Structure formats: C-alpha cells, structure tokens
Amino acid sequence: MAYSTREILLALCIRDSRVHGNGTLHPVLELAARETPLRLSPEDTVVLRYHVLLEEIIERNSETFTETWNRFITHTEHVDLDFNSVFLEIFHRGDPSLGRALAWMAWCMHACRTLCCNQSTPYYVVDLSVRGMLEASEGLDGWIHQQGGWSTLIED
C-alpha cells in the first residue's frame, strides 16, 4: 500500500467500466493507466470494497449526482480546469472528512460512468473529464496519508 488517490480513483473507474455495459475500457482509461503509472489492480480487494461504498453513495443520491453532473457538463468551457474548482470548493471549506472524500470519489466515478456509457459523447470530453478528475484528486493525497492510507481507512 501507500497508493495515491489518482491510482485508486483510476482503479475504481476501470473496475466500474468493466462491470458496466459490455465491460470495455474507453481509450482514455487505457491512456490514464499508462500515463499515471497505474500500479493498482482494478480487481484488487481495496478497489472492490471501495467500489461498493461509492456505488451505495451513488444510489442513495442517484438524482443529485445525475443533476449535478449534467449542470456541470452542459456549462463548462474547459472541463479540465472546472474539475479543479469544484474540488477546492468541497475540500478547503472546513477541512476534509471521510464522507466528503468518499462523496467526491463517488461523484468522479459516477461522472466517468456516464461519459463512457453514452456512445455519442465526444472523445475529448471523456478525455478531459477523466484527466480533470484524476488531477484534482491528487489534493486528497496529503490528508489520506495523515489517516494511514486508503487501505487502512477501509480496514477500520
């Protein structure tokens, strides 16, 4: 362990894509895995367990996640930069806590799912969004280190 938020997020999105509508990976998830030197398996036990938690969060809040995601994607002009803004508005507004971290992860993964499922979403949107979410999430790194890492967090 000591895996980055980037690797865990990417392992969740890959895991998710596998579990969803014929299980193929979008080109940009193949790329991110290459460029993020993806060292974590998407079928690893931390990933499978976190997948459960995030999928629950998404269901309890199915409509909010949908609504919020659409408002974002229909209004952004640079998807890349805009991911970084919502991240900061969540996290540097009274510390991070477990739920906000997990609600963000849930949100990114959900976002990824919607993009890779919709066959007509342009490549560049799927691409910048994924890059957008992985880069923003680097900001959780220091704070999850303070807590012993992702594997630790889900262990207790």
Partner: peptide, 23 residues
C-alpha cells in the same frame, strides 16, 4: 456562470456530512 461548480460543491458537502453519521 461558474456558479454551478459552487452548487455541486454545496451538495457534495451535504452528502459528505450526511454520510459521516450513517456509517
């Protein structure tokens, strides 16, 4: 406009808090 991102940030904060006592 640049006001949606701050709405989303609001929601996720709530859901984040909601979760905290609920697991």
């Amino acid at each position: 406009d640049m006001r949606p991102e701050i709405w989303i940030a609001q929601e996720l904060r709530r859901i984040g808090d909601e979760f905290n006592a609920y697991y």
